[model samples]
Target: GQGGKDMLSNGIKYLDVPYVAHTLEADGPEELVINCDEVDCTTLVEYVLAETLTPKLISESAFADNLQKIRYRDGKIDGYTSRLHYIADWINNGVRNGFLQDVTGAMSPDTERLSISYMSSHPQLYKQLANSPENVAKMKKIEQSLSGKEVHYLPKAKLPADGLPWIKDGDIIAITTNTPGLDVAHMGIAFYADNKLLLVHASSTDKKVVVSKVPLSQMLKDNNKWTGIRVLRMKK
Candidate 1:
């Protein structure tokens, strides 16, 4: 679809942008952060997806609106808990809101029970949750809302040797983690070259955005902590 290609082009435009994690977190109340200069994995995906929602002229506020729409539940910023912490929930909300489609199931993936509690469980890791027990309580509820739901994923060991034709350019790839209390370990946009699935993402390792040096399946096989991937697509 046009959204996928446009999203890919928009992401490629920011190659070499520095990877700055937790750009949205602050000691104050939660607010929409609009920065293209630096990005972590998910924020990079968030920006490119939001950009596709803007028209030809490209209004900054419109971009901000789309960012908020993508980042917060139902596009409303309530607090830290309002943010989409889990990638699967973000995909679900986006699908319900008519901007995204979770395409992992169509890929004939294996299923795993959803068991998210990372944010609430690791409150010390988050600035907003550090002093706010109330927010942590709310986050636990959010995690409860996701637990036990069936999640589809393409296991790293089972990433098609043929490089599945169904995966389109710019398809959002969420790397599922084996880590307890977390759903996705990282995220990126799909980039195909030489008929292999690579990735375009803000890399904590490279400290900048770059296409993967190796195919995604190989990368996953090397990284033991990461289990598999759940793919999503932008609606055109």
Candidate 2:
């Protein structure tokens, strides 16, 4: 929603914003609190989108509305089930609603895709699924909708030795996974610095949002949990 003079500049500026973890509760009911005091990867991006879209300063309620549209399916937060907790599902809705365009499908001749049903299979782990049969049914519906949703991405093994040249600042980066029932494990914004593309994301490992100390390619080499990344560009 917000476009900077350049994407990199926008990303660099937000690196200083406070990092919030578990802003979305694992067990509690859905809360539409505009607490910039804490932010995770998704909230961090949602804040940026809302902030950038406004030509002038926006009121708290307005920003909350924007975040609601970005965070919930159909822009309605009926409950925990209403939120797009999964990264791939979030992207799918964002693209379908014309909020952002999907660049993953256009990445290469044969990009990778994973069939996701993690929530449906592992319902015990999620409170929303475990506590309510209705919620479980709703989650199943959401996962079923994602079936055959081929999420394309660039594999770590396939990345050029020299790294990505087309990658630009402000491009969205979603870390793809080999873990069953999941598509992307993490998501972030990209920045070009010192001849390498770096990730600026809310890190659960570090317990806050911060730019990676290493380049994107370096991250792939270090983290086995993540297999690769899918790229998306903000729509003009």
Candidate 3:
């Protein structure tokens, strides 16, 4: 019948309706059309955001410029670009260098028995501690000086449900679960969309950052088999 054909053609016709607008204020339902043709910009920021990871080198000023291009519409991510990767890297490096201290002392020093205080108090000595082979041997001897002392296991913990404070706006998060009988099975980052908690992290099977959801309670659960998750947030 012509009715079905007419309906399909009508749907196609309506698909080009101006659903997006660029007005500061509007009192009615009519959408505004943005005339970007004369804008004459070299690159479309939205395209960059869609294709690149955070900490990517789009250009010299791209970091700040990209942040301004996205617009919110209809309670969904209208034009979110992949910017979380930079934030994740920032968090990872910050923690690696002791931005925050944990119960096990500094969260990231490979040398055993070398405490954070040792590094802070004796900067020159710390530098000398990791030099040549002989110095490395001496350092090992010094490390053994603390033998029979109590040692604590302090691998990086999964970020709290509230999120790590050092996390910036566009960081991607890599995480490990502290669940019993579960190997480090998952990783992701926190992002906002539609006022909901979102995650962007590496997919185990796909090996790429993908967006998903993990409730706060599940994110922080404790089990003996899992020693808390480890995270590597990407940065720019």
Please give the distance, in angstroms, between residue 2's alpha carbon in candidate 3 and its true position after superposition: 53
Candidate RMSDs in Å, in order, are: 1.2, 2.6, 20.3
Candidate 2 Cα deviation (angstroms), residue 4: 5.6
* Candidate 3 lDDT, 64-176, residue by residue in tens: 33232222221122211111112222232234543212222234332222121232223354333333454445434433442333323223344445544443233323333
Model 1 lDDT on a 0 to 1 scale: 0.88
Task: Please give the lDDT score at residue 89 for candidate 1.
Answer: 87
Best by the lDDT measure = 1
TM-score quality measure for candidate 1: 0.96
Better of 2 and 3 by TM-score: 2
Model 2 misses residue 61 by how many Å?
3.3
Give the TM-score of each candidate. 0.96, 0.87, 0.27
Which number leads on TM-score? 1
Off by over 4 Å in 1: none
Weakest 10 consecutive residues of candidate 2 by summed lDDT: 1-10
